[PDB]
Every structure is written in C-alpha cells, then in structure tokens.
Design a protein around this ligand. Structure first.
Ligand code: NI
Lengths: 399, 403
C-alpha cells in the first residue's frame, strides 16, 4: 500500500471485503417494446399472408380461435413486412434458417435491453457509473461475447462491471435474474445491480403447420419486450427510494412434469414441444410450494398478498386463481400485461411487477403492492420449474 | 426460528434493516474439487494423421504439415474426447468445413455434457463426504450446445439432487466461465447461511469440431487445443468442524473487458456449429493489461512481488502462460500446474482452470508444501475469453501439515 511518496506493509480468516446489511430492494424498473404494433384480432390475416398459408383456411380458423381466446389485445414486434420479406427462410416451416435469425436477434436483443435499462436508470436517477453488476437473461439467440456485454457497451457501463449472462432459460428467467441480483446486491456493500430480460421473436417465428400445434399456440402468444430493474441493498437516504424488498427467493421442479416443455435450438431456429398439462401441473402444486414461504412471515390467507405472476397464457391465470380462490383483482396486473403485450417470455413478469406499482399509484393504494404488505413474484417454464420471490412492498403515500 | 410462534407476522427477522433468512458469516471456501474426462485418449503427436484422415483432407499436405507444427508446439501431450472414428463417421456433416450440422452436434452434446458433469460432481461430492441432499445450489457453465431444460437440470436429475435446488445456468460463455461459476458460487454461498454450492463446468468438442481450412488458421489452432473435460467444486461458507475441511477461501472476485480488445475473440453459433474467430493477439492483450488489473488486489494482501502469490491460470494455449510469466517475472514453478493440465488434457475451455486449481492442491500435497497454494498464502485464479474478458478470484490457501 502506497502513501504519498513512500510505502507501508489483510484479513486472515474473516472476509476481506464487506457485505451489505439490509435486504436487496427494487430501486427502479424500466421497460421497452419494439415500435410495430400488431392487433390480435386480425393477426391471423397478417400471419397467414406473410407465411404464404392462405390456402390453409382450416388451420387459419384454428389459429383465429386460439388468438380469440388468448386474452391478448395486441403485441409489439421488431419483425415486420420488410424484414420477413428479406428473410424468406424464416417464413417457411422448417427450412434451414438459424443464421439469419441469429443475425437479427444478436442485434435487436441488446438494443431493446438498452432502452429498458435507460428507462430504469432514469427513474433511479443515479450515474450509470454506480452500476456494479449486470445480470441478464434472454431466450432469443446466443453469441460470444454475450448480449449482456453488448448491452453494457451500448449503455457505457464501467469496463469492470461484473456480469452474469443466462441464455436460453425460458419463461421463468424473469424471477431468475432477480434471484441472482438479490445475492449479488446483498453480498456486496455498495453494489447496484442492473437486472435485465430482453426477448424478441426472431428465433421462434415460423410458418403455421397442422403437424405442429404447439407452434400455433406460440405464434399466438409470444411478443417482444425487455424490462430492467435496478437492485440494491441499503438505499441511500434522499437519492434512492425502495419500492419492494426481496426477502426470499426459491424454486422447484414439479413432480411428474418431466418433458412438460422442451425447447430445442435447431438449424431451423427455436422449436417448442409440449407434452403434458402445464396449467394443471402448476395449479396442483403451486399451493404447497408457496405455503412454507407464506408461513415465514405469518401470512395465513392467499388474499392478504399481492401477486405478480408470469402471464404465460389465460389458462394458467384462470386455474391458479380458481385454485387459490383469489379475489378477481389479485391477478389483474398480470392480465393487463397479457392483454397489452402478450407473452414476452422472461421479461413478462417484470412488466407485471411494474404494473403492480403502477396500479397502486393510480388507485391511491397504501403500498406499492396494491395495498398489501407481502406478495409473490412468480415465474415458470421448462423442466416445469416454478421460480418465486417473496416481496415486501414499501408504504405509499395516499391522498 | 418461531420464537413460540404466537405472533409470526411480527417476530420474523424481515424488515427494511434486517433479513428474513440469515446470510453466512465467513468467506466462501472451496471444500472439495472433482474432475472427469471422456475415455478416448488421443495422443497429440499423431493427432494430425487421424484429424486429416477423418476430415478427408489428405489432399492438403501443406496444411497438414502446418497443423503438425502447431500440434508439436502446443504444449499438449494428449487430450480426451467423447468423439471417436465411429461417431464421426456416423455424422459426416461434422467432418466437413462448414456444411449444415448443428442438429448432429446438438444431439451429441446435449447428452454428453450432463453425463461428464455428473461424474465430476460425484467425485467432488465423494471427497466432500456429505449427503448430496445438503447441496442447496447448482451453478453450471458450458459452451458445448444449449437445451431447454438446461444442462444444469439434466445434471441435477442424474445426481438426484433435491427438487428445490436453486439453479444458475450460464450457456455459451467461453473460456472465462471457470472463474465465473466460482464468482457466482461465492455470492450464493456467503449470502445464505448453510448454503452448499455445486459449481460445475463441463465441455465437449462436438459443437466445435470441423475440417481444417487454409482460410481459417486461428481455427486450425483451435483444433489443436480444444479437448473434453468437466470439473466440479463444492463451495460453502462457515465449514462445519470435523466434517468439512476448507482448502481455499475466496476473498475477491472481479473482472474487466480489456482496452482496445473489441473483436479479439468472437464465437458464432451457426448452422454449421460453433465457429471461433480470433482477430487480435490474445496473449499480447492479456499480458499488457493483467498487471494493472491485479495490482491493487496484490498490494491489498501485502504482496510486493508477483512471486509471493500462487497461481491457477486458464491454460488457453502455451503462449499466454509464457508471456504472462515473463511479464510478471514469475519463477517457472508458478505456472507449472497450468502447464501440467495443458500437457495432460489440452484446453477444456471453462473447465480447464478448475483442473488447474485441483492440480495446485495436488502438487502442494505431493511436494510437502506448507499450504494448499504450494507454500503461498494468497493466490489468483484467472480465466479469459470473449469480449476479451479477464476474470479473476483472489484465493487464500489454508495451512497444510508438513512432514
Ligand atoms: Ni505513510
């Protein structure tokens, strides 16, 4: 260790560098979606036209039916007429097309992530140089260097930012980035984590086929979007304001769910195959999984909690709601996102959490959790994994 | 604790200034290390013959002579591969330069990665000596293929870990992931009381194997270095006396993207598999910046000479070892563990550096050294890869009984 013009000559057993004291907290949230808006009502027309499937009326009627019951009003896509016409392979069913899909995704994911991040950083109000870690997830393509570095570069973060990139995880990654951010923020004094999820449909988009019904469901639900969250423990008075506190983060693989959802990255892009009743498996096991955690804070009723659930589709929301006998308004934030954005994979649940904060603000509620002190952020996906975080919502001033 | 359980909504430890679930007290420690490699042994001396035969490139004698010179100076004596003549003959597309073959490669890698990871994990668990049910988290990385569900769940199932194990899967990261899984394990272990993390790196070459090309020399070099292998480390804070024994303590984990290193290393996952492009002198960039990156940490621990520390450096070829060694003026013994691994296994991507750390421990034991760091108290574990990212962990080696 140098001192002035001379020198002097650390922690044997104990830790050389200190950890934080308080629980990790959500300090800000931001989001972004591409410019092209596609109304669900007439999406079948565009879809069957661009994929040259107009001579398949029965299949189109099937897709229209799926779209009509999707609970989705509109979706945002980077993909448009021009891009798809310039990439005919992507408009076929299974023709070799990974290279053109990767070219699109590798560029769009970090771009959308940067916008969501800037929105979060703007609400946060602190210099981007204070960001010490970046944690990111996407199921839209893979590259080396990863999308997290591409994003950090677009944002102009410090060269020594600690990174965690989690590619190809699926619909439960929204909860995953927060679980990872929680430990990074809590175990490092002063740490401020930028947690991101960015998804684009370039890798999954493909022509409809009666030989791939699962593909029909995906083409009706998946949309584009990115969300960013600033996470940190020990908020500084005056310049930072906690919205939620993270107190528990866990997950589990559901019994008898092997093969429920398989995702294969192939020469033709990403293809999903479903084998079991996902909504059923989740509904049957969700209660037992959550019970233990609720008990940690003495919560007895499901309705005393607020919910930020991944809007995988209308079926999962309806069945869980019924199973837990929740008041109609408990899942409204989730339904609001499904309606305005569709299923944006991992970023969806983050959009839902921001919406919970939004509804609390506009409805003059006593907390950021629409009036409830404790709540669950839930994500689910492949392996039939259910991820969950127990959040405590901070007080919100009322009129 | 329930504290009687009469007022659970108020007696729990969760508040704006306290936590519901306790974190650990001490630094995360390496409690055990295990490794595994596939059965097929390919001698480097004659790899060129096999390679040019299987890729049908015998009509390129000049390119072969060039490959032979690369293999002869690679610092590698042998490598272990899952791939063999039979498998490659059953997958002709993989024996070409750039013909569509991703689906062939994916089928092979998806099954092999978790299998090798399971073997490595079982060895680490066996050394640790505790019930596998005590594993609370699994952190894994691989650059060999991608699947949904991921390799970490596939590995957890093969191992029979608890259904609620917390997972972190990091696909397609590259050669620095060995340090990465440890940096992640460090935070998970230290922030959760009782947590025991299984950190894994498993790599197979099915996705990168391909025919040599006169237009892709950096690619030819890769074909001489990449081998298969998996390593697993059990990480946990507050070791339990009598049933656990700390080998190394982790005290710092950092990383940085080197200046002027854009495009230094690009890895593209294509219809023809994973293709690497090295546009800059990798060892040069690392050698030029490594000193300044570690300087402050080195001074923090009270070391004035780089020789006062032990080392576990990713053996990404012989040049990085030679150049950094010269730059930091290290005695030949400092990088010997790294050279031993390069010699016996080649470059196993992310798992390599973990093999090296295990080797440092082994050399300490066989040489009657005073610590698990071959006599030194502090040391650096270093990995590097794409985005010219350098990852490093500061480790403290525990004392070792001497005869
Ligand atoms: Ni002084």
């Amino acid at each position: 260790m140098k001192h002035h013009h001379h020198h002097h000559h650390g922690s044997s057993r104990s830790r050389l560098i200190a950890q934080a004291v308080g629980p990790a907290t959500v300090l800000a949230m931001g989001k972004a979606v591409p410019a092209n808006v596609f109304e669900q009502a007439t999406y079948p027309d565009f879809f069957f036209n661009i994929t040259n499937s107009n001579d398949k009326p029965a299949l189109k009627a099937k897709f229209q039916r799926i779209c009509d019951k999707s609970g989705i009003k509109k979706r945002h896509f980077y993909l448009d007429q021009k891009i798809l016409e310039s990439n005919p392979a992507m408009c076929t069913y299974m023709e070799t097309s990974l290279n053109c899909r990767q070219e699109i995704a590798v560029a769009q994911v970090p771009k959308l992530a940067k916008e969501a991040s800037m929105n979060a950083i703007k609400e946060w109000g602190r210099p981007k140089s204070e960001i010490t870690h970046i944690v990111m997830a996407t199921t839209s393509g893979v590259n080396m260097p990863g999308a997290e570095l591409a994003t950090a570069k677009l944002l102009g973060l410090r060269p020594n930012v600690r990174r965690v990139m989690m590619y190809q995880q699926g619909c439960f990654a929204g909860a995953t980035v927060l679980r990872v951010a929680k430990d990074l923020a809590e175990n490092n004094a002063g740490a401020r984590v930028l947690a991101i999820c960015s998804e684009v449909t370039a890798v999954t988009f493909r022509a409809p086929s009666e030989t791939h019904i699962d593909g029909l469901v995906g083409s009706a639900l998946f949309g584009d979007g990115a969300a960013a969250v600033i996470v940190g423990s020990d908020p500084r008075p005056g310049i930072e304001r906690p919205i939620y506190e993270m107190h528990w983060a866990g997950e589990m693989v559901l019994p008898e769910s092997d093969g429920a959802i398989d995702g294969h990255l192939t020469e033709a892009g990403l293809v999903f195959h479903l084998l079991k009743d996902v909504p059923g498996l989740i509904t049957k096991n969700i209660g037992g999984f959550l019970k233990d955690t609720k008990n940690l804070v003495g919560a007895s009723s499901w309705n005393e909690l607020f919910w930020a659930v991944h809007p995988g589709g209308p079926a999962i929301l309806d069945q869980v709601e019924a199973k837990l006998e929740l008041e109609k308004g408990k899942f409204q934030a989730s339904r609001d996102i499904l309606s305005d954005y569709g299923n944006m994979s991992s970023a969806s649940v983050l959009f839902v959490l921001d919406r919970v904060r939004e509804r609390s603000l506009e409805s003059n509620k006593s907390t950021f959790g629409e009036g409830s002190e404790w709540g669950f952020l839930i994500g689910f996906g492949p392996g039939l994994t259910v991820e969950t975080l127990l959040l405590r919502a901070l007080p919100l001033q009322q009129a």
